[PDB]
Every structure is written in C-alpha cells, then in structure tokens.
Amino acid sequence: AKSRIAILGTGGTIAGFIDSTIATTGGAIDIDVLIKAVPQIRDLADISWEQIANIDSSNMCDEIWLRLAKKIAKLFAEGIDGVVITHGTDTMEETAYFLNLTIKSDKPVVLVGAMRPSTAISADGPKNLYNAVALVVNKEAKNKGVMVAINDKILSARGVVKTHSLNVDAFSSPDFGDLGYIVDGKVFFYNNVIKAHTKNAPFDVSKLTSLPKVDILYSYSNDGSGVAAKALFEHGTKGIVVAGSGAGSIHKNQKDVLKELLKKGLKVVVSSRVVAGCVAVSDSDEKLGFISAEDLNPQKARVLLMLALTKTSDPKKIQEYFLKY
Amino acid sequence: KSRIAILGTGGTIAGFIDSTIATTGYAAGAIDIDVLIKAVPQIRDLADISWEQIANIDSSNMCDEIWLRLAKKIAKLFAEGIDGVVITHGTDTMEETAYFLNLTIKSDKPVVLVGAMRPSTAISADGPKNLYNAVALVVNKEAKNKGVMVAINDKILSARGVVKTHSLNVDAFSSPDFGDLGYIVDGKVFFYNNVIKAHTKNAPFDVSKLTSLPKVDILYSYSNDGSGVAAKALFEHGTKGIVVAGSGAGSIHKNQKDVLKELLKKGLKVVVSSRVVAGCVAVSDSDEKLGFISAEDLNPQKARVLLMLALTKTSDPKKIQEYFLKY
Amino acid sequence: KSRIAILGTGGTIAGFIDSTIATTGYAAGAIDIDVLIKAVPQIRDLADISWEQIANIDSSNMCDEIWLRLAKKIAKLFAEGIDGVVITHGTDTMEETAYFLNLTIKSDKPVVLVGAMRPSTAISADGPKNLYNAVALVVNKEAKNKGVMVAINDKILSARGVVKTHSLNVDAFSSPDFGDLGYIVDGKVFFYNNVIKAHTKNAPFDVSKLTSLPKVDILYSYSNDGSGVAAKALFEHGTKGIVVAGSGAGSIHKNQKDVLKELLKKGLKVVVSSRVVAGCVAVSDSDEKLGFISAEDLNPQKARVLLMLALTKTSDPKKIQEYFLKY
Amino acid sequence: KSRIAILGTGGTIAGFIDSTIATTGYAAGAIDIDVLIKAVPQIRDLADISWEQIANIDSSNMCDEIWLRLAKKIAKLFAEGIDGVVITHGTDTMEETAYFLNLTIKSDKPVVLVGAMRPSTAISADGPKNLYNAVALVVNKEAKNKGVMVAINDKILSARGVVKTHSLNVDAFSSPDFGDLGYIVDGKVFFYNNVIKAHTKNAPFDVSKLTSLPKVDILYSYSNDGSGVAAKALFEHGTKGIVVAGSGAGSIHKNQKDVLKELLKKGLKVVVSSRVVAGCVAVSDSDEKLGFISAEDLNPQKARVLLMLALTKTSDPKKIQEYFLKY
C-alpha cells in the first residue's frame, strides 16, 4: 500500500509557461498537467494536491507562510505521510527555514522548484518533481528537518541558499553542504543537520494571523541607509536585519542611527552580504543590543528574528535563539 | 629596481589586538604602512619602495572622499615616474574600491589592492606573505594593462570580477562569474586570463575635477518586502539612484517595485541587481522601457559604483544601460 | 546564416534506454546524429546546418584514430567554406578530445564540443538545450579566435581549462584553474575572458600526415605505492612517455619514483601531473635535471595530450618542458 | 583538564627551507614534533599535552607499516587514559591515513589529523594556527563520537568525506560530496553536521594483530587506455586488488577493461572508482555479476583503503560491495 503524499502548490517557474521554448525568464499551469509529464510519480505514492498560492515567489508574503504551516499540520493529523511544496526558486530558502521552525511533525516536508518554465526545452521541473516525491516516501526521510530537493541534491532548510541566479544548478549550502543526493529516485543521505528543528523548535504560529514586522537594510561604502532605518522605524518596523560588509560590519553612517534606534526599542540583527562564513559582533555592541545572526544570511535571519519576536522582546534571549536554531 | 609606491588606507593587514589567538575583535588601521613593510624586508629586494598613509580606517567606513583622494594621488604618482602602485586596504569593501579605481585611473601601469583576513599580530598572520606577493605582482613585466587587480591568498583577481565570498576564511575572495586572472607561487606570477571588460585608459569616466559623487544607495528584496517605505525616504532625502538587491535574477517584490515605479516617474534612476552571488539578472523589455536598468552580473555594491560614475556623464537610462553592458 | 557543420561522435547525448526516469544504465551512441537535430527545430533557424557521423561510440573508449580523423575532417571542412563546427561528444573524455583539437586545428573558426549528462530519452534531458546553445555559440560573431571550446550547462569553457568535476550532475564541467570563458542565456552569448595560453593557429603541432601518435600512458601515486612494477612493464611494452598523477603538487612515492629514475636513464619521458583537481605541480631543480618534466596545472589525461604531441617534434625533456610552459 | 596526545608523522608542517619566502622545495619532516608544540605556548592552556614522534617523513612516502603502528598506538593510548589525539601529518596523503584510522580505531574519543601547506619556516606559515585549532577541537565537549576528523584552515572535515582539492593553496581541503562538519573560530568550535556513514566502533575492521596489509594498487583510465599491460604486471607480482580511476562515473576504456575481466576470472578483486573529484560511480548489474565493485563516491586512493581492509575479512565481491555501501 502506497504512502499518501500531498503536493501544496504556491506558484513558481515550475508551474509557469512562456510562449517561447528557448525562453526561461518571466502565465500559469495546472498541477495535474505537471504530473502528466511524470506519470510514474503516481507509482511512488497516492497523490493528492491543493493550491495554497499561485505567485512568483519574489512576491511571497507572511500570510502564505501562516497558511502553509497550519495546512501541513492539519494534513499530517489526517494521516498524510509526507508533503511536497511546489515553490518558486527566488524565496524558496526563506519559506523553507520558516516551515522548519514551525512544523512539529517528524514527517517529510520537501520544497521543490525549477529554473526553467515547463515549456522550455530541457525543462528541469519534471525530474525535480519526480525526485521530490521519491524523497518524501523514502523510509530514511523522517526527522531530517524541512528540506529542499533540486537538481538531484538534498539541502537542509537551515543551510540552503540560492547561489546562482540563472543556472539549473542554483542551490547550495554555503556553510553546511548537502544532506544528500538523489540518483534516479534513489535517495542517499550523507549528513544529519545538527541544528534543532521542527518538534524541537519552540515556535507556535497556530494562533497567529500576522507576524512582527521585520525589514532588511544593506551596508556599503558611503552608506546612506541611516535615512532608511529611521523611516522604517517610524512606519512600524519592529526589527531590522542588516546585511553588513565582511563579517557583519555596519558602516558608521548607518550604525550611529541604529544605535539611536536601539535605545527606542528597535531590535537589530547583524547579518552579512557575504555568502559564506559567520558574522562577528563585539562584546561592546552586544551590550547595546546588537544580535549576531551567526552564519544566517539576511533573508533567513529575518525569518528567525520574526519568530523570536512572537515569544520575547529581550535581545539576550533572541541571541540564544540565533545560537541554537 | 623599479619604483613602486605603497599606499595605506588602513584595514586588517594593519590591525592590532593584544591576543595572538584572536582574529575577530581587533582594531583595523592600528599600524603604519611603514611598519608592515619592515616586517617583510624582502619586498625591498623586489623594488624601490616608497610609501604613504592616505588614511587609516576600517574599510566598512569607506566613503567617496577617500576614493576621490586615492584616484588623484595615483594619477599624480604615475605622472611623476612611479612604475606601479600597491594599496593596502581592509577586506570588507576592497571589491568596491577596486572597481572604482578600475574605471577612473588613466594608466596601464599596475594597480594592486591587498589585504589580510587576520590582524598583523595574529598567529599565522595573513598579511606578510600577501604584501610580499602584491609587490611581486606589481613589479612583474606582464602586469601592465591588466586593469586594476586584487591580489590576495596567492590568487590574482580582476577588479571587475572580484567579490568577497567568505567572511572569516583566509581564502576569502573569488570571481564568482569571471574566474581568476592568475596565480602567485612564491613571488612568481602566472596569468591565465585576460579580462575583456574595458578598463583604465578605455573607461570614459573622469573624476579629477570632482569633489563629490552622485548619491546612490542600496535596497534589498525579500518575502513581505517593506523596502517601499525606505525607497521613498531615500528619494526624499536626495538619493539620486537606488540599486536593488533583487531576489533570483533581479526580481523585486511587488510592494517595493510599485514604489520604485512611482519614483522612476519622478526622476530616480533604478538599477536592478541581485542578492544572489553568481549569475546575471534579467529585466523584461517592459521594465526597461519604464527605466529599470540591468546590473547584469555586478552585485549591488559594485553596481552602485558603476551607476554613480554613469551619473557623472549622463542622465539617460538608455545610456546608463549601455555602460552596464560594457564596463 | 553561418554554414555550420555538426559532427556526431556518439556519447550520452545520443544515448538511449527504455525507462524515461533512468539515467545510469543507458546505451551511449544508440541514436543517429541527425535525429537529435530534428528534435531542436529552433536550431535550423540559427544557421545553415549540415552533419555527418564520424563515429557513434562511448567516449570512455576514445582513441587516437578518432582524434586524427576528427582533426583532419575539420581541417577539410574549414577549407570548404564551413564557418564553424559543433562536436557532439560523450562527457567522459571530452576534455581530452577538446585539448587535442585545440592544439591541432589550424583555423581561427569556432569549434565547440557539446554533450549531455542525461540520455536523450530521459525526462528533463539536458541534451537539446545544450545542443541549441552550442549552435548559438558557433554562430556568434564573437566566437572567433577563442580557441576550441566546450559548451555545456550554459557555461562556455576553454579547452585548456576544462575538466569534468562531477560524474552525475548536469552541472558536470568547470575550469578549476582558469574559470569560464563565458555564459549563455537564452541563445545569447556573453564572454568574460580570453584565455592567454596559445592555441590553434599558434600551436606548432601538425598531425595531417600522421596515422598514429606516440604511446603515452598514465600512472597514479598513493600511499605504499606499488606502481614501480607498472612503470617497468609499460616501458617494456613500447611506452614512450608516462604521465604520473602525483599526490599534492606532483609528489611521487619513493617506490615508483626510484623506478621512474632508472627508466629516465633509458629513454622514457616522464611528466609530473597531479591527482588533485586544482592547482599547479612543483618539480624541483634537481628532479628536472634528471629529466622530470612539470605538467604545471594540466591534469593527467590532458597532460597526456601535450606530451604525446610534444613527442611528434622532439624527445628533449628541456624542450617538452618549454611546450608545457606555453600551451 | 583533558589529556591530549600529539603524534608526529612529519609533513610540511614540520618542513624546513632556508628561505622565509619560499614555500616549495623544502624538506618535509625536518622538525621534531616537540619544537612545533613549544612554538605555540597557548596550546598548554587547552590541555595536558604529551607527544610522541611516530615517524618524520614526507607524506607522499606514506606506507602500510606506519598506518598499522598509528592505529595500534592510538588504541593503546586511549585505553591508558588519553582523552584525545592529534596527528601532525603531511597533506599529500592525509585523506588516506585519515580514512584508514576512521575504519580501524574502536573508540569514540576525538582523533584529529592536521597539517600545513607552508613550511614551518615560511612567512605567514599556517602550521601554528592549524595546530592550535586542532587541539581546541579535540578538547571540545562536542568532539566525541564524530568519527575521525581532519581540521585544517579553520574547517572541520570528516575522514569519510575529506579530499585534497588544491595542490598549492592554504585552503587545500574540502569534501566534494559530504561538505564540511563544522568550522573553528579562534579555538571556538562550531559543529553543523553528523556524518551518517558508520565509523570507528561500528566498523568491523580489526588490525590489532596485523603486521601487513593486502596488496591493493591503483590504475587510471583515459583515451586509448594502455593500462592492461600494467594490470597484468601488477597481478603477477602479487597485487590482490586493483582500484581503477575510471572516466566519468566509473567508465573504463575497453582496452584495460577487457584485461580486467580476464583478471577477474583469475581471482583479482576489482574496484571501480573515478578520476572525477565529485559524484558517485555507476556499475551495471552485468558488470557487478562479473565481480566489478562500485567505489560509490570514494576516490581511488580512499577506495584503496577500504578494499584493503575488506580483504582482511573476505574475498567475496558481494561482501566487499556491501562494505562500500556502508562505510
């Protein structure tokens, strides 16, 4: 008897179509039509599906994250064995980490997308979907954390980052490297991610309708973002993640303003515009409230800071979260 | 020997900390250029070495004024006989300073930026061998007309390609898209590639009579993007151009892009870049008509450099786009 | 409309197998080359296309015969007005063929090798896109005098730099030392570098009158190395040169190297390559007097090509070594 | 305070050369392990340090006897109260030694190999920070039961995954397939992963009574492969098993492969690996039935380690294959 797998659609290039077949950059397609490109998918599982959203992932929003988390918990309660989320590549890393911190089950939750529309020549979407379904039914897939499966690689939510903007091979874990690899429906695990997740993460969004407002600024030569920070704070921003230079260096023009705003209750997380590595926040700045995002990139750091702000307002406790999840 | 000028701007290669184990909580620009040089007597074999402190800052606090100062200083040095220049520089914004110099210096003579990931006081300090190698490169015969170069961790990277890609590791820089110009083995230089993007004498930007640059700032895009609030305030406070670190190949969340569209109609230039480390962005023909400019493969901070310089020549988005394709 | 010839050599791109999901157990070289073309209709829009099956084998079983023929057939074509050549090839030894042709083709006209990691019958087969991009490349006005190239997974790699660095992934090729020549997006060719190492017209190798090449074999170095016994046997059976894949930067275990030393004295040519994927090998001054030749950054199989061709002109280690510094 | 044994085997980390600039040509294995320890004082604050010199050699000359000696010494020290071990080792075959230990040490206590790419005496020598980090690691509470490790250049890599991927750079090691276990920041350890493949206690190999190991050699596949000759010679002179560095996903050119088939019928064990740095090998059912064994993702030299230990238990290809799927 087959595993019951549910596919939740959110949109994305994987379910898109463009008029040309050579053209990759950008209407919409039905998921039933996706499955007919990989019929044998129905051999791996008894497949049910629902539409959670239909967007370009670049347009992701909190509401979608909330629904997804609540939907997944509901289906797992009804004996769904695993979930595949068709998603766009642009913000897949963001959605992945969110669900990784909000879903209590040990059951497989896999995000999958494609770099080429369904009508392109050499479309990578069919194989990816196949592998994703093959991954969620595999017996070793429990307790791994939320995962991304693209281009035959299995990536952990906690580590996954988009590292090429155009190439079919678009994803990576710049600091952890892959959980494993897939060779024609055959799953091979290399690692277990140590960072605590799912049932072992203390975030409960079942009752929430919105999330604390967190936004993102950048740092550079002649930084003029001080202006942007004040304006964000005056418009309800509860938290700011800064993409610092090197290991979390924030240009003084901007840093003076953030210092002011710390004393007024803004939470400030220091992240980095650099793809690999960890940030360093001095003991001095930590005392002021600056929170280190460790190795978490700016958009992922935003995810954890938001969820942290549903529980506490104390920068010391928030820092504890960033050290653990 | 050939006449080589080493200019200090500060950085970690000149950084200090009382502990020998530590490499993370130091003060950048704590050491004079002329002290770093005595720590590596051998560089005096390679050339007639002279030096000068242009600044002693943490590169994260870089600013236009130093850039302008540095381009003028280098012009003057070359015009009075100096054969090549090494710049010691923090790593954080090194990629920015290099690309600016790549497009503003009118000589074929070698300009090399160098730095360290570890403070000069540290165990297995980074800086010494890096300075040695930088001097060896700038004295090499094949080093002319290469464009501005970053020489670090034995690798030779082009101004136009170089990006800091690790925040802690000694092997911290690469050319995500272009790939290294060359490699350095014990002072010996090997080139692999010619960079093809026009540079130096062939880049049309002149900063010699300028005391300021057009204001360009950077914004980011992500789920539930709120940068819209930010874009309007930057624009209201004199920001002339915005570089957006889009998701994917330069996608901008609808909340921010709507506002960008408003501000385009009011004279703001917008360059679309990417928060993604390698690859090019794509901008649709219709957004291009609106005035969105493709950063191509340049990242946000480097895209800002080119846009800034483009505003000293033109206001026409069409032509700014031609620059982004060429330089 | 350029006149472009596509030469079918075989490989996985012409691969077949019963299952659509399958990728490992296919039959490379089952599908005739003209079939593959009809499958990408947009191709005939880019050029006036012609084709011919030079061979339909597994690139695993590549040989000198095929290389000699292939280089002659291309010589012919470019003298009959053909503007560029695309070579569909298995992925396994594409890097060897590419480097050979790069040193043996006397034209400046584009020669692009292309292959696939998935058999033409698999879902999400990469072959058709790859074949499209290779035709786009060869037809491009800027593809002149670039060297022999490899066009696969949207990347454009030079023959002198290309190596397979993944055995299963469609992202299978890179240049661990030079880095990409350029990129392709949607038929559009973008060039980032020109490789400086001389090639084609400027390589002194002529194979037009050769029906065979000097015998050159490859050995590996490792802990408790037992290869000495292999070196002797090879030598006794006509081997004219041996390329060694040393550990690190060309270190050869004392057990093998001692044998290699006796053999040097009896006429054997020895080239020191490496088993490490990136970097350069370092041969000491005294090893080089013995006759050890450094491969520099060439990997073993690619180093084999240069040593082999080298032996059509000389047997002086001092001059082969110069060939390794230049090509 | 934990008791830590530092075992010296030589390597570049104990290398010496007259020049402070030069980084090639030195004599590896020149400095006593105690001198290297006394060079970094702070190490004494991390733990109660003892040291023994096991050998002082160039690691390209590693052999079975040193391996057996190491394995036994570690087992002994662990049973007599040592909390962790650090082995200073040459970088050339560090993969090999590391993986041997991974399969033969029946304890959960940390074992860490460390080395350097620059001789002790060179400027910006890496050795000292590497030795410090390695001690900090073996002392970390989280370091238990992680499998044998390589710590170098601030990275922590598992024996099962570690491979030397650059021949000259200080950043010389990675895990093409498994990635990194963690990172060190000034003796501050951060773990990211647990490797899943069985190691140490859960590995069934016992070399406690061995004075010798089964003879396993390595060959290479390439265009016009002539390795058949070397294979016959190796077999006849005593080789029990050969690993082949095949092209792409373990493809072996027909010339060598037909000879191996003949050798399979004579009791040769054949393991199929790849010259390709990342990815996993593919063997057909038909070939497996003849007795070809897939090395999976194990490179030639590390596959040799496992084939060799397997041969101490069984000569059954079916059984050896199960080992390659598990360890």
Which CATH number characterizes residue C74's domain?
Answer: 3.40.50.1170
Of D301, D311, D237, D241, the residue nearest D92 (C-alpha): D301
C-alpha Rg value of chain B to the nearest Å: 20
Distance from C-alpha of C242 to C-alpha of C228, rounded to nearest angstrom: 12
DSSP state of D222: -
Select from A177, A181, A191 the Cβ nearest to the Cβ of D194.
A191
DSSP state of A252: H
B77 and B113, same structural domain? yes
User: Catalytic residue at D91?
Assistant: yes
Any idea which residue has 């998603």 for tokens? A87
Residues of A in contact with C124 (CB under 8 A): 122-128
Question: Do A85 and A11 contact (CB within 8 A), yes or no?
Answer: no
Element (H, E) at B150: strand B149-152
Distance from C-alpha of C75 to C-alpha of B164, rounded to nearest angstrom: 45
- Please enumerate, by residue number, every residue of A annotated as part of a binding site for substrate: 57, 89-90
Nearest Cα of chain A lies from the Cα of D277 at a distance, in angstroms, of 15
Question: Do D25 and D17 contact (CB within 8 A), yes or no?
Answer: yes
- Interface partners of chain C (CB pairs < 8 Å, 3 or more) are A, B, D
A60 and A191, same structural domain? yes
Of the residues D9, D12, D93, D97, only one is catalytic, namely D12
Distance from C-alpha of B93 to C-alpha of A220, rounded to nearest angstrom: 7
Sign of CA dihedral B11, B14, B19, B21: positive
D93 and D229, same structural domain? no
User: Which pair of tokens denotes residue B30?
Assistant: 């704590």
Distance from first CA to last CA of chain B, Å, rounded?
34
Question: Do D152 and D114 contact (CB within 8 A), yes or no?
Answer: yes
Distance from C-alpha of C270 to C-alpha of C291, rounded to nearest angstrom: 7
Contacts of C311 (CB under 8 A, 6+ apart): C213, C214, C216, C240, C241, C269, C320
Of the residues A10, A24, A86, A89, only one is catalytic, namely A89
D181 and D299, same structural domain? no
Of D265, D253, D247, D250, the residue nearest D226 (C-alpha): D253
Element (H, E) at D137: helix D127-139
Of C208, C261, C281, C268, the residue nearest C238 (C-alpha): C268
B224 and B173, same structural domain? no
Q: How far is CA D86 from CA A61, D50, D192, in A?
A: 50, 10, 21
Strand D216-220 vs strand D241-246: parallel, antiparallel, or unpaired?
parallel
Number of Cβ within a 10 Å radius of residue B259: 22
Q: How far is CA C269 from CA A36, C244, C272, D320, in A?
A: 59, 11, 10, 38
Task: Give CA torsion, residues A65, A68, A74, A76, to 10 deg.
Answer: -120
User: Which pair of tokens denotes residue D165?
Assistant: 């991927």
Reported as half-sphere exposure (CB side, CA atoms, 13 A), residue A206 has a value of 7
Question: Do C275 and C221 contact (CB within 8 A), yes or no?
Answer: yes
Any idea which residue has 């060439």 for tokens? C298
C220 and C185, same structural domain? no
Question: Do D110 and D135 contact (CB within 8 A), yes or no?
Answer: no
Any idea which residue has 């220091």 for tokens? A270
Distance from C-alpha of A8 to C-alpha of A111, rounded to nearest angstrom: 9
Residue D40 to residue B123, Cβ atoms within 8 A: yes
Q: What is the SS3 assignment for B144?
A: coil
Of A94, A274, C193, the residue nearest B277 (C-alpha): A274
Distance from C-alpha of D29 to C-alpha of D170, rounded to nearest angstrom: 18
Residue B301 to residue A221, Cβ atoms within 8 A: yes
Distance from C-alpha of D74 to C-alpha of D138, rounded to nearest angstrom: 14
Any idea which residue has 């599906």 for tokens? A49
- Please enumerate, by residue number, every residue of A annotated as part of a binding site: 57, 89-90
User: Which pair of tokens denotes residue C302?
Assistant: 């690619």
Distance from C-alpha of A206 to C-alpha of A71, rounded to nearest angstrom: 10
Task: Give CA torsion, residues C292, C295, C297, C300, to 10 deg.
Answer: -110
Region class of A198: left (phi > 0), else alpha (psi between -120 and 50), else beta: left
Residue C21 to residue A37, Cβ atoms within 8 A: no
Q: How far is CA A130 from CA A88, A113, A146, in A?
A: 16, 11, 18
A317 and A186, same structural domain? no
Question: Do D269 and D320 contact (CB within 8 A), yes or no?
Answer: yes
Contacts of A209 (CB under 8 A, 6+ apart): A66
Distance from C-alpha of C8 to C-alpha of D88, rounded to nearest angstrom: 52
- Interface partners of chain A (CB pairs < 8 Å, 3 or more) are B, C, D
Strand A46-55 vs strand A82-86: parallel, antiparallel, or unpaired?
unpaired
Element (H, E) at A147: strand A147-150
Of the residues D23, D91, D97, D239, only one is catalytic, namely D91
* DSSP H helical ranges for A123-275: 125-137, 226-233, 252-262
Element (H, E) at A49: strand A46-55
Question: Do D26 and D12 contact (CB within 8 A), yes or no?
Answer: yes
Distance from C-alpha of B207 to C-alpha of B212, rounded to nearest angstrom: 9
Of B128, A248, B168, the residue nearest D154 (C-alpha): B168
Sign of CA dihedral C38, C43, C45, C46: negative
Nearest CA in chain D to B173: D171
Tell which of C214, C229, C250 closes a domain: C214
Contacts of D126 (CB under 8 A, 6+ apart): B124, D116, D117, D118, D153, D170
Residue A175 to residue D185, Cβ atoms within 8 A: no
* Mutation choice for B interface testing from D19, D123, D157, D188 by most B CBs within 10 A: D123
b/e C96-106 (16+ beta carbons within 10 angstroms → b): bbbbbbbbbbb
- Interface partners of chain B (CB pairs < 8 Å, 3 or more) are A, C, D
B176 and B155, same structural domain? yes
Q: What is the SS3 assignment for D83?
A: coil
Distance from C-alpha of B160 to C-alpha of B297, rounded to nearest angstrom: 10
Sign of CA dihedral A85, A89, A91, A92: positive
Number of residue pairs across A and D with CB atoms under 8 Å? 48
Of the residues B9, B23, B88, B91, only one is catalytic, namely B91
User: Which pair of tokens denotes residue C106?
Assistant: 């006397």
Residues of D in contact with C97 (CB under 8 A): 223
User: Catalytic residue at D12?
Assistant: yes
User: Which pair of tokens denotes residue B108?
Assistant: 């074929």
Residue D177 to residue A181, Cβ atoms within 8 A: yes
Any idea which residue has 């026009």 for tokens? B198
D111 and D43, same structural domain? yes
Strands (DSSP E) along chain D, which ranges? Answer: 3-10, 48-57, 84-88, 111-114, 149-152, 155-158, 163-164, 173-174, 182-185, 188-191, 193-195, 216-220, 241-246, 269-274, 292-294
Reported as half-sphere exposure (CB side, CA atoms, 13 A), residue B221 has a value of 31
C243 and C158, same structural domain? no
Nearest CA in chain B to C154: B279
Residue A223 CA, distance from chain mean position = 28
* DSSP H helical ranges for B183-284: 227-236, 254-264
C6 and C133, same structural domain? yes
Residues with their C more than 2.5 Å from the N of the next written residue in chain C, i.e. before a break, are none
* DSSP H helical ranges for chain C: 33-38, 64-79, 94-104, 127-139, 228-236, 254-264, 285-290, 300-313, 317-326
Element (H, E) at B73: helix B64-79
Residues of C in contact with A25 (CB under 8 A): 185-186
Tell which of D214, D234, D267 closes a domain: D214
User: Which pair of tokens denotes residue C213?
Assistant: 């090449």
User: Which pair of tokens denotes residue C3?
Assistant: 């006149």
Task: For chain C, count helices (H), then strands (E).
Answer: 9, 15
Sheet holding B48-57, edge to edge: B48-57, B3-10, B84-88, B111-114, B149-152, B155-158, B182-185, B188-191
DSSP state of C237: T
Experimental method: X-ray
| The residue type at C229 | V
Number of residue pairs across B and D with CB atoms under 8 Å? 67
Residues of D in contact with C285 (CB under 8 A): 25
Distance from C-alpha of A37 to C-alpha of A30, rounded to nearest angstrom: 12
User: Which pair of tokens denotes residue D269?
Assistant: 């064990």
Residues of C in contact with B182 (CB under 8 A): none
Question: Do C74 and C110 contact (CB within 8 A), yes or no?
Answer: no
C191 and C246, same structural domain? no
Of B129, B104, B101, B103, the residue nearest B115 (C-alpha): B129
Contacts of D263 (CB under 8 A, 6+ apart): D231, D232, D235, D242, D270
Nearest Cα of chain B lies from the Cα of D135 at a distance, in angstroms, of 13
User: Which pair of tokens denotes residue A224?
Assistant: 């003029």
Distance from C-alpha of B136 to C-alpha of D120, rounded to nearest angstrom: 22
Contacts of D10 (CB under 8 A, 6+ apart): D28, D29, D55, D56, D57, D58, D59, D88, D89, D90
Strands (DSSP E) along D81-140, which ranges? Answer: 84-88, 111-114
Strand A153-156 vs strand A161-162: parallel, antiparallel, or unpaired?
unpaired
Domain residues for the domain of C128 are: 1-214
* Mutation choice for D interface testing from C9, C100, C167 by most D CBs within 10 A: C167
Distance from C-alpha of B112 to C-alpha of B119, rounded to nearest angstrom: 20
Nearest CA in chain D to C62: D223
Q: How far is CA B273 from CA A43, B152, B276, B324, in A?
A: 43, 26, 9, 11
DSSP state of C218: E
Distance from C-alpha of B27 to C-alpha of B23, rounded to nearest angstrom: 10
Angle, nearest 10°, between helix axes D64-79 and D94-104? 50
Nearest Cα of chain D lies from the Cα of B34 at a distance, in angstroms, of 18
Tell which of D165, D197, D214 closes a domain: D214
**CATH code of the domain covering residue A261:** 3.40.50.40
Distance from C-alpha of A246 to C-alpha of B59, rounded to nearest angstrom: 10
Residue D169 to residue B154, Cβ atoms within 8 A: yes
Length of chain A: 325
CA angle B183–B189–B193, rounded 5-degree value: 55
Domain count, chain C: 2
Task: Give CA torsion, residues D230, D236, D241, D246, to 10 deg.
Answer: 20
Question: Which residues of C fall below an 8 Å CB-CB distance to B?
Answer: 161, 175, 177-180, 183, 185, 190-197, 280, 282
User: Which pair of tokens denotes residue D30?
Assistant: 């020149």
Contacts of C214 (CB under 8 A, 6+ apart): C240, C241, C308, C311, C312
Q: How far is CA A268 from CA A254, A255, C225, in A?
A: 12, 10, 57
Question: Do A95 and A57 contact (CB within 8 A), yes or no?
Answer: yes
Strands (DSSP E) along D41-95, which ranges? Answer: 48-57, 84-88
Length of chain D: 327
Residue D39 CA, distance from chain mean position = 26
* Mutation choice for D interface testing from C59, C223, C308 by most D CBs within 10 A: C223
Distance from first CA to last CA of chain D, Å, rounded?
33
Residue A217 to residue B234, Cβ atoms within 8 A: no
Nearest Cα of chain B lies from the Cα of C197 at a distance, in angstroms, of 7
Strand D269-274 vs strand D292-294: parallel, antiparallel, or unpaired?
parallel
